[PDB]
């Protein structure tokens, strides 16, 4: 139940406390982020699972990344990218991998995963995504063109 969610929140804690070190975020903002992260985490660890919960989780993390990106330019602080941004991107990649494993037939989820890998992920991670796509969706010529186009 809450043991896995607790593990994930304690994993999320260090980048939040580093953000509090930055001065990018205030303590009440950290509390609100923790609360909403726990609320979103509780939905995707249930016995009955829906795709929209995964979509909302991914969208919330993307919005948090965008907010951090906007605030870093105003502050002028460019250090500690790896401590926060890479951790968030790794968590989002794990969420995408679980969602794609659960629902293989949904092409739209695969394309959203490809788009996020293009925007935020290393090129080799995007390379692995196309191989997973073409392995089970080799009967669609358009997907072959998109991989060759990239």
Partner 1 sequence: QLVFPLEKEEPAIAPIEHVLSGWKARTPLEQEIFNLLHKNKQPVTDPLLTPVEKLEEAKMRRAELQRARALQSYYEAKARREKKIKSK
Partner 2 sequence: FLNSTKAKLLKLTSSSIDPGLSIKQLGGLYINFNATQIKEKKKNELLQKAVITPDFEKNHCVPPYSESKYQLQ
Partner 3 sequence: AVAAAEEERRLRQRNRLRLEEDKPAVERCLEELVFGDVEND
Partner RNA sequence: UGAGAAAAGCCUUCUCUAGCGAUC
The residues of the shown chain that bind partner 1, judged by CB under 8 A, are 124, 127-128, 130-132, 147
Q: Which of 23, 59, 63, 94 binds RNA (CB under 7 A)?
A: 94
Rounded CA separation 138/147 (Å): 12
In the chain, DSSP assigns E strands to none
| Segment 61 to 80, residues that bind partner 2, using CB under 8 A | 62
Q: Check binding of 19 to partner 2 (CB under 8 A).
A: no
Shortest distance, CB of residue 101 to RNA, whole angstroms?
4
CA distance 113 to 97: 9
Q: Site for partner 3 (CB under 8 A): which residue of 75, 107, 111, 115? A: 75
8 A C-beta contact, residue 84 and residue 29: no
**How many Å apart are CA 112 and CA 115, to the nearest integer?**
5
Count of CB atoms situated within 10 Å of the CB of 82? 8
67 binds, among partner 3, partner 1, RNA, none (CB under 5 to 8 A by kind): partner 3
- Residues 36-55 touching RNA, rule: CB under 7 A, are 47-49
Cα separation, 58 vs 95, in Å, equals: 7
Location of structure tokens 């009967």: 139
Q: Which residue among 50, 66, 98, 127 contacts partner 3 (CB under 8 A)? A: 66
Residues in contact with RNA by the rule CB under 7 A? 4, 47-49, 94, 97-98, 101-102
């Amino acid at each position: 139940m809450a043991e896995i969610i607790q593990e994930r929140i304690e994993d999320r804690l260090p980048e939040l406390e580093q953000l509090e070190r930055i001065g990018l975020f205030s303590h009440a903002e950290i509390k609100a982020i923790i609360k909403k992260a726990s609320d979103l985490e509780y939905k995707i660890q249930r016995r009955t699972l829906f795709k929209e919960d995964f979509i909302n989780y991914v969208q919330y993390e993307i919005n948090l990344l965008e907010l951090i990106q906007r605030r870093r330019t105003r502050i002028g602080y460019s250090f500690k990218k790896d401590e926060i941004e890479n951790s968030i991107v790794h968590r989002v990649q794990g969420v995408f991998q679980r969602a794609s494993a659960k629902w293989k037939d949904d092409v739209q989820l695969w394309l959203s995963y490809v788009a996020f890998c293009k925007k935020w992920a290393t090129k080799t991670r995007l390379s692995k995504v196309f191989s997973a796509m073409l392995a089970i969706h080799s009967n669609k010529p358009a997907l072959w063109i998109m991989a060759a186009k990239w």
